[model samples]
Target chain A: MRIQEAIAQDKTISVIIDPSQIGSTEGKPLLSMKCNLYIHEILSRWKASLEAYHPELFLDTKKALFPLLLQLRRNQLAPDLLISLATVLYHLQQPKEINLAVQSYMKLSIGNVAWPIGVANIMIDERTRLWITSIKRLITFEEWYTSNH
Target chain B: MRIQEAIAQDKTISVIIDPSQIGSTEGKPLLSMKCNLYIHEILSRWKASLEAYHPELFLDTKKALFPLLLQLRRNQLAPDLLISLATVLYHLQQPKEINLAVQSYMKLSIGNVAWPIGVTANIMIDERTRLWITSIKRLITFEEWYTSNH
Candidate 1:
């Protein structure tokens, strides 16, 4: 079952990012986003995991995650959620999926929402490659890129 | 109308985080969290904005925001939502309200959820001050405190 459905239905699924995988050093909590893995790769892998296990559900995951991809208002593409959303979008290479992702990206960029802090570099998003680079982001993604990697 | 009721009735709220207030830097989108104010303070101020104009509605805001407070598991004490919840709690100081807020905090802290990243400083809470220091957050909060604010 999709994690969102599990959460809504109050059923348990495996932890997407285990606690042991994320820990505090001295004190700061480590985010899965901070994990050295390429976010796109992780997202891509997760998509494959679902596709292989539940091809039937991949479409639904695509539909549900479509909003997260399209809803990129300031910091709207949050971490854990974004990781999953982008992954699903990466694999669903249909004209409509790409179109929806593109439209949402436009909604964030050209639409009314003032996207401050700039594009979060959602760097390494090769899975979807929605051309995160084709547009202006809030900051130099490279800066965030270098820091994280 | 109560915000919660409006929500249940499926009424939409105008944006709490104004789009105009946020803008792209030389190009990076600044986050509300990066704006240098406690998310709690922002939440508090907005609640007051609504309360003065609509006293009866304030109760609804409380009922509505309670879930946001109750549902905060680790990184979920998100911005716009957190603002309203903390603001209502900041004032309710009544025994029942404090008790409710305490229960929710305990829910986040004690619930089966693994609480990954750890404690958000949430230090400036003008509300109940539940001694967050007493527990281990989704992770160690001290480091984030130094890195972000220190």
Candidate 2:
């Protein structure tokens, strides 16, 4: 069962993992995609002055997503998470990874997506959504087929 | 040795930390504040579309702080974290606990401080800063001091 399930529903003997963090148990960091976000809601703060309201220590934390994405690669996350992450990367700076990031993002989603990122861009109209679909059209069928299979 | 020491000195070890994140170990979770911030650089985003951000989760975490702060009842956090949290609370809609949060925030920092929170308001002219210092001065008196000593 998922950690959220474990916490919400009572298991006779569920793992008492600190879902607030990643990695654990009897000194073994096993088959887990431990997260870098302090809370899953980090994405929602994309509009807030994360850098302004906090310290450099905190500001640095918000900007550290490329590495966070890499850590995520260690797990089995929804493929569209790439778009969400890349969007934050785009906001932070015109990150070098965006084009390829979207390619992989499209590859994983099989050209169709329901991105949570739209919540971050509520005002920006459909251009980003159209742009993403347009990019998806460029991926080779082999990658698309391979990813879906 | 603290992680900040390594970060300040710029060691190869710093790579393990997502400077945008709160904490971590060699590759594990340690020496970190493990915060709810979307980024360490909160000052930048505050000027943008904070109004659009989700509040339920953030407020939940802040409420979680009450219990967490209570845990810190045995220790001390920087006095200003009260203001930091209060500012967010004020922004969020003057929720259920700003008053006591300041009280407990002051209760903690009795342990130690290196508050980077002050940098959030570079505006020397802001009323909150002046009020914070004025409050700090007020707190320095023997009444609060008696509790700190006792």
Candidate 3:
């Protein structure tokens, strides 16, 4: 099966391969292999976009995405689409679009289900938040909305 | 006699007090207390200089001093003046100087003095090294320098 198909079909797969299993004799090897494959797939799929992104910007996105993806998978939840989308937007330097998408996500998904996604999204967009708050004093929500749509 | 005077006049006792004698029977409280006092004195003396020196500038100087101090101390040669001087230099962010001084002490002092001082120095400096190197590098310089200095 294709990777996305495998991921989509297996609701319990993430929980089964959680990082907490890394220390178990049986699970440890499997967990390591799975994480390596996951990381490799992520990098391969986004290689072009990552290359085009600034080094610091790309690293910032990865740092945020790594923990969020790990946490979501551990909890057996579908990864937040908004966080993934926001990461792509930030890497692309679509600042206005990133902001709009994030705001919409925050407004629509305001509960425990949204917690992991929200935190990850915040980390990915931290630079933007700092800039808008410090420089503009006003957010350009329209840009964020347009990008996500 | 006052502590400083005792230390200065060669009357300073290194009693090797039993852990049980100093306090509660269980926790090795005396050793902990002694270590705390030693660390406090060393850190306080160096606080000003350490604060002044940024991370990048201080780590290399620290790495260089580790071998010299360790070597001297290992050989049973007590260089008291050098040790005190190294302590002061260590305060000034010259880790190499402090290390060399400790090495000298280890070489001269009678009995197998536990090289806690050197170990502590390495532990504190290694954190800064990790930041600069972006990965852990060896802080244990004793083995490599041991043969060369001999």
Candidate 4:
């Protein structure tokens, strides 16, 4: 089962897989798609739990999302995914990966133009949300980075 | 004496004074200045505790800052103070006061341009930091609001 499920059923045992080994050993293309969907679920549930003030669930979501974030960063996933990942990492208080994700998103947004046919329609709204989210997270991350450093 | 001191001393007892009654009871001008200084201390300590991952201390800082945030918002202090208060509130996950603080800071930044002579020099870097902090918090807050509302 997934990390969320593991968290729900109090089986926080199996959630500690190495983030580094994710895309190294297995079906590379399949893993990227799975990472995308898994990240989407984690982000969705994280927001839901945050709104409801489920501190345990929210904290677990952060713990679960941490490894996934590092995996996606190493894998060099889509800008949209990077933005979402960066946003969550921003909340997770990881200075390094959020910085990396934001940098990657910045470069990718300008260079990458080709879009898959099925995702074109969703891209409109999705890109807007990602744009807005990235801008916010980037500035927040910068100020946070500045203040500490 | 103070919340931080109390928290440090295992005296979380006196930290719960009603936020609503802060400026209402007494010491009008004096309390505002005190609020400014008090918030500065809390914010400073909060940052230090956060970096160290002192969860108990960090959590207490949030608890301690919440009441001060309400008092400052209700009192309608300087935009710089409001921005600082709003940043802390953003971390605390209080959407309503944060929105109010952001709105208040926005209007104040534009309309009120008076600078006390003693503070003129400090305003340069201070204003820049506040500007950056406010911009980040506002956009983050807006996206968070959008996702939940829509």
Off by over 4 Å in 4: A1-103, A111-128, A135-143, A146-149, B1-150
For all candidates, the clash counts are 25, 34, 24, 0
Cα lDDT computed for each candidate against the true fold: 0.31, 0.31, 0.33, 0.39
> Quick one: best DockQ, which candidate?
4
Categorize the docking of model 1.
incorrect
lDDT of 2 at B26: 46
lDDT of 1 by residue, B22-135 (tens): 222321112222221233333444343331233233334444434333334222344433433333222222223433434434443432211112112232432332233122
Model 3: share of true interface contacts reproduced: 0.00
The best candidate by TM-score is 4
Query: After best superposition, candidate 2 residue A62: deviation in angstroms?
Result: 8.8
Q: State model 4's lDDT.
A: 0.39
Tens digit of lDDT per residue, candidate 3, span B1-150? 443333333423332323223223332322333322333333332222332222232334444544433332232223332233233223222334435544533432322222224334212223322242221111213212322343
Candidate with the greatest lDDT versus the true structure: 4
- How would you encode candidate 3's per-residue C-alpha lDDT over A40-117 as one tens digit per residue? 344443433322222223343455455544433353222343333223222223343455435544432332112222
Distance from true position, residue A49, model 2, in Å? 11
Listed in order, each prediction's TM-score against the native is 0.15, 0.19, 0.21, 0.25
- Report each candidate's C-alpha RMSD, comma-separated, in the order given: 25.0, 20.1, 19.7, 15.2
TM-score of 3: 0.21
Residue pair clashes in candidate 4: none
DockQ of every model listed?
0.01, 0.03, 0.01, 0.04
lDDT (Cα, tens digit) per residue for candidate 4, span A13-71: 22222333332434333334444444555455434323223232333344444554555
